């Protein structure tokens, strides 16, 4: 753990987003993401805009429509709630910005897609390292607080198509300004 070595350290968090989550009729807590707005600005701007609802649409009231234990939880389909919908603030879909960042471990936030250059509003939150998705899905954030809430969602009962048996809803969401951007660990 020598500090010189240590300092030579991942991307800087430039803005935060919160989700307040519900499972069935139960409040389960807040998750806070730190987003890498200097590394993937276009991707971060899309996520943050959808969290604030500033374009007249976005994540509020949408579901986590797929949960796979020891893999990830997925949501952001605010138009159909099943993985076939959603749209970006740039149009239906938008290209892969870069693959600078990897799925380093649990709690990393990455764009769902249906092939090259098909990013919309759908995202997933890893609950393990998912290195097989590196270079194919655009990573743009990390859970900073509330990983325990993520784990509650991850463990919720699902049907045979990995759909939660109780709806897991984003009850509220929004952005939190970060005055002094700060680097986090690549893990």
């Amino acid at each position: 753990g020598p500090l010189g070595s240590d300092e030579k350290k991942g991307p800087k968090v430039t803005v935060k987003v919160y989700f307040d989550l519900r499972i069935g009729d139960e409040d389960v807590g807040r998750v806070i993401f730190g987003l890498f707005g200097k590394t993937v600005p276009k991707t971060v701007d899309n996520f943050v805009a959808l969290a604030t609802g500033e374009k007249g649409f976005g994540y509020k009231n949408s579901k986590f429509h797929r949960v796979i234990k020891d893999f990830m939880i997925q949501g952001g389909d605010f138009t159909r709630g099943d993985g076939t919908g959603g749209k970006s603030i740039y149009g239906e879909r938008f290209p892969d910005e870069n693959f600078k960042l990897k799925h380093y471990g649990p709690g990393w936030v990455s764009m769902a897609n249906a092939g090259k250059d098909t990013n919309g509003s759908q995202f997933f939150i890893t609950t393990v390292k998912t290195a097989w998705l590196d270079g194919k899905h655009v990573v743009f954030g990390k859970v900073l607080e509330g990983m325990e809430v993520v784990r509650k969602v991850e463990s919720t009962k699902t049907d045979s198509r990995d759909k939660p048996l109780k709806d897991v809803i984003i009850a509220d969401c929004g952005k939190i300004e970060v005055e002094k951007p700060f680097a986090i660990a690549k893990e």
Binding site: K9, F36, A183, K186
Partner: peptide
């Protein structure tokens, strides 16, 4: 393309 300060190592 890379920026060490903002993207990390």
């Amino acid at each position: 393309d890379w920026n060490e300060d903002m993207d990390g190592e």
